[PDB]
Amino acid sequence: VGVGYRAQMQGKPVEIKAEENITFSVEKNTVVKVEGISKEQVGALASNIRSVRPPEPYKGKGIRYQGEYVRRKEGKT
């Protein structure tokens, strides 16, 4: 899902290192297909770009393959 949501603070006697709260400038947000010859390297990059946003249990928001489980909880550590 292409949205860009990432943390919260609003805005993008001293601030925590100048400015804060920066998400990501949506450029693609469409079904991406990696084209390679080495399965090993292909898998690494594929999972490397799949770690950007781990499939959340809320509505499966984030790069993933197909697996997904509905949920809405994070109150106990």
Place this chain on the structure above:
RNA sequence: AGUACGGGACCGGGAUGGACAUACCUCUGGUGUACCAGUUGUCGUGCCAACGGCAUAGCUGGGUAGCUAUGUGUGGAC
């Protein structure tokens, strides 16, 4: 955008603090018994003075150099 989530998130990134460590005396202070000034009692040079001796440095108000913190800098990042 205070949008998700249903009040309040992890994300790169100038500087303000607390405690502690270290260096120094320009500044604010402290001390400064061979520096300057004011003043009480008594003794000594015929009288009075000036000055000297003793009284915690006689007492009181300031204070140079030096040594100092509560004073002035820097650090702990990457």
